[PDB]
Design a protein around this ligand. Sequence first.
Ligand code: ZN
Ligand code: ZN
Ligand code: ZN
Lengths: 115, 1131, 46, 63, 67
Amino acid sequence: MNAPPAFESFLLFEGEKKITINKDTKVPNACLFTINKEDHTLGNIIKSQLLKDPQVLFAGYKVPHPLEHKIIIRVQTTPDYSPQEAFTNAITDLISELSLLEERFRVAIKDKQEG
Amino acid sequence: DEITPDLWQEACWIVISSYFDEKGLVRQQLDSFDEFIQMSVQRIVEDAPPIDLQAPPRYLLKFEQIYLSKPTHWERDGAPSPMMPNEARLRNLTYSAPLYVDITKTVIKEGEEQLQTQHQKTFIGKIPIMLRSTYCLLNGLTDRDLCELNECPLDPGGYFIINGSEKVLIAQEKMATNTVYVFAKKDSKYAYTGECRSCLENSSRPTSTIWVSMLARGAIGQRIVATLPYIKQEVPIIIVFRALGFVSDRDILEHIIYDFEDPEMMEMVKPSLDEAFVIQEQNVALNFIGSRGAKPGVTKEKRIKYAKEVLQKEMLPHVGVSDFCETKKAYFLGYMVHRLLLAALGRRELDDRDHYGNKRLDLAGPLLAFLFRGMFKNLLKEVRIYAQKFIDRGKDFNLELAIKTRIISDGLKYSLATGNWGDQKKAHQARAGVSQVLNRLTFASTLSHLRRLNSPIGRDGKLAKPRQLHNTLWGMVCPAETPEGHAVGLVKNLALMAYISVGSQPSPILEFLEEWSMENLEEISPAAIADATKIFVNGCWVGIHKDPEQLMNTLRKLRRQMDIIVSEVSMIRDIREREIRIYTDAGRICRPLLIVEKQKLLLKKRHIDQLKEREYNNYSWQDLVASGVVEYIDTLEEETVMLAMTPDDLQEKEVAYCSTYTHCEIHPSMILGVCASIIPFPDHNQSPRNTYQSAMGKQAMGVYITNFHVRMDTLAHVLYYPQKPLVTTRSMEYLRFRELPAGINSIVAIASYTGYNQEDSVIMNRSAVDRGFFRSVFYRSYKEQESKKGFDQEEVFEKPTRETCQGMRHAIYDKLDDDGLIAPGVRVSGDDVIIGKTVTLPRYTKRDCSTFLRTSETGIVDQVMVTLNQEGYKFCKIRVRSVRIPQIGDKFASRHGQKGTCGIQYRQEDMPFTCEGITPDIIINPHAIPSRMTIGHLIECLQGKVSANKGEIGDATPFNDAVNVQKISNLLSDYGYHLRGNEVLYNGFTGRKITSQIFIGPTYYQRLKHMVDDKIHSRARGPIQILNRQPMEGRSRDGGLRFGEMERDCQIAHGAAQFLRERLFEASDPYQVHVCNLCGIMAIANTRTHTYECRGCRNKTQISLVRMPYACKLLFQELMSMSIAPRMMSV
Amino acid sequence: QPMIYICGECHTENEIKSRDPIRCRECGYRIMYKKRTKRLVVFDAR
Amino acid sequence: YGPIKRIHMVYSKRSGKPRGYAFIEYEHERDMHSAYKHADGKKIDGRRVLVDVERGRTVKGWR
Amino acid sequence: MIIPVRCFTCGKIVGNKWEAYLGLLQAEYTEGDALDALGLKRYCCRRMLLAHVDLIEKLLNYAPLEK
Ligand SMILES: [Zn+2]
Ligand SMILES: [Zn+2]
Ligand SMILES: [Zn+2]
């Protein structure tokens, strides 16, 4: 009667943006990233990678509601830095880490398959 | 030879299995109906008086014998063919068999010119048959043969089939008859009241209740009276004694007081003597009695006659209704007073109205007999008038046309179909609730419903005494299985080993006693009653004895050898009170128990050996009872019995507690019912919780019956993947829960995860649900038939058409076939049509009467059936199938009362997990454990974790000292898990460990039919009723919600007047009327022609419009009907 | 147009037209079952 | 039509196959006659069956 | 009524273990040793094979609707 489609969690709706940036007015150099059709899989890795950046004063994620499949990520950086730049570098760093982890896994698989 | 303690646990359960292998679960229902067909019906026919009618020629029409064939069905052609139960449930027929009685009509006119004519096998009427009974077609059939007939071998039976509805007779509780009970009412003119509901052995009239009361102190002392039947005025007991032929006060007291050396009793009866001393003869006493009644004959002659027949027929009929029995009635009436004096003098304790030893269970046997008796009389009546109006003309008559077989058939059919116990006219004096629709939601509910009891005290009653769990519910009834609504304690459930007596004749016992040294009542002298012991039989005082010790030892020896006395006979020897009451009546709830010798049991090891090879040497429970090892004990006999919970109590202890045991329990777990036996470790949980579970086990989904694909039931929930409980009791093997389970073993974790499981809620694993976790299917059957009642209008199944049919909704009828019925495998949604039916008119010459589907169903047609009903008309059944996936709102419940709805469904990735990839299928809030104290839920979660890792099935028998929490913990530490069940979990969102080691393990959970899709309801400008223009009532009618008085009071406190107005006036029934400003009565308004006038005042200008609810306008109209003039004055 | 029905006892596919009392010409059984439709029904394996 | 005291289904002596005919003994003589008219023409297992009083030991000169 | 395909908790295939599980029990094997030979270590999968009731075997005792 009301069971929502399962693919509605990952597929973006027509006319809906994958990510929206809203400048926070409470404190300076802060932004809120409202990403649609995501879950804790991405919020945590981006959160953790953001904390490791010393120019990031605040980095957190939340799910407004589990039934929804969106996520909100708050990023506060130093005046000399920018939050959007941190969200970008955090992704670029994660991509390189996975690329390195991927290559090092093939080698381990190859070394194990041979002997 | 002796069973050692280590082998006891195996022997007791072995003995139990033999019981359930021979008797069964619904044996009390089958034996009742069986004895009714074999003895009751034959006796009711013979006990009827021969109808002697004469204008002259005369006819008696005496019946001699009966014959009841198997259930049969006669078509229109008349070909007799056998009808199977599956055919009845499908064709909406009645699973009844014809009753054939032999009649003999002798002509007697004059001159001894007699000649007899016998009509062998006269079809007198049809009788519904109990499934699986002796006369049922499914008797003795093997599991393979029953499968050929599309029947479930596990179906216990014990129910009827009337018009396709499976009806079951609920055993009705009632106060025992022919027994003296001395009560004491606090607010009444009498201090102590001794009543005795009397009824003859072969019941033929209602219970003639006689009271023997004592007047409260404040002439000189306390006077004793007697409220006899058919008399509206109290009568001194002495007057009654004199009316029976005992004028001398000495003889009277000799019947009341058996020991003249007790002046305390003599001083207490003196006031009654001095109150009635002017009367000293039998004739005057009878005249006085007749005068006190509501029918005082002007002449003293018929006054004496009215009293004579009253004291001979209505007063104590069980003691005897013939003449010359005045002595027996006096002796009993004397004992009736003797009981009253002992109660007032404190020499005896008052009787408890709740004591089931003083109650009787009216089963189908004693129940159906009451109807057949009352109707058989109506049949002989209709036969009398019919033949009477024929012999008056001086000619013979054909009894074949006189026998109105419709009487018995339609009668038994109506009673078992509607529940009203009585004639079709007395639909209000009869007691409803009997013959309820059998619950086919799960095997546990069916067994419980077939083993259900009912006390006719009335749910309206607010007295807690009858609803309380009396001590006498032990072993006979489940102390936990009982509803929690407005019927607590009244609606009960029999125990596993409970057996209600079927009934037996006391003739053989009386013969043995007479052959014994017992002395009759008329042969003895009252002087011998002092030291002698009384002997009662079914409440009838028979005689006395001198050495009662060896008497019971003899009677007990006879019952234990299956001798003249049957096992169902109860023999209570009250010792302080010298009475010895023997009972053979039906309804006496009893249970088996292991006899005990001086200090040892009679169940030796040689028996357990033979019971193990039960399939080879045909050694069953019956051979065990005949060996004198087991004994059927009733509630009334338990008072004189000293039980032993287990053989361990029979051993020698440092301090002897009893040392004189006489009986022993097979297993204490047998005190539980059906829905309570499935609970593991019920002795570790709060009692109400075990009760709430017993009420949920009947609502749990599963496989209610194996042959669910053939049965076209209106509502049936089937579970996709049923599983047997890893933590099970050794009683499930007999309830067949292992074969037809009603739940799934779930890996539950008691933790607070996001807070979506708080306040009796749970969080489910969406991935498990995707793999068939608790998934079920909903079967709904829609029935319809085309009626050819008359040529005026005839219904017919046919694809409607927009050009010929009138009442055709906007829905499309393309899914239907030319036959008018939809085909299986088709997808059907709400508002869709499944049966295209049209009715001929007196959109011309035919109207559409199609059957649409219920809203919010979205199901698929599983199959379609077409057949012929009793009237030879077409009858179609469409079973729709809808898969119900467990979602947010669906109710789940464990076996310990832990009920809750699925708060949210988390995927396997978002759920916690142990060091290994084991996510919990369900997560509950631990806050439900402390308040409810359901420790069994924790131990079950533990024993389940040991059983899964060990490869066995946990034995969670309630009372088993060989299994505790310590042993389970040690066994769990051997498989690499925490001995207390706790386990480290990892947060599924961040992977971080959880500081608090969570408790996790397998727990058997159940899904309840109470889903959210069947309860979600909304309304916005929907239909309204006809009487009052208010929203309808119910989801099926798209009704609205009730804004009750309590809501009106709440919004009043808030001061919200507009809301209270919008809800009660604008959103429920807004209406406009026109009233005359002079008389305030509703005027005649015509908005089309713009004219308003009040006929009364004859004015048409002083009219005012009023915006009032329609219900108020209806109220004023309902008042004006009573000449009341509610005038709405707008000024 | 044919509207072939099935029996409960013999399982014989017999033709039954409207306005005809229900009775199996092969065994006389009075209960008839309809055959699975020919329409294409889809079932999502979810 | 009535209770059956005993029932005898004949079988092939050498082949053991079912002959196709049986003898039914009712408890009362009256119960049988009720079946004589009704049983004849019955349909059992989809094949029509006939029923007549067995003349092997009643009718004179019957074979 | 018939052995499921996957385990509701983990997701391991169990549909191909019922017949093998029965073939072992009749070989005088214990329920635990049998589940170990099939590769069922977690108590979640062992639950499916040890708590299942083969009801379909009883549903096949009734003749079908079509011959
Ligand atoms: Zn007026
Ligand atoms: Zn057929
Ligand atoms: Zn698993």
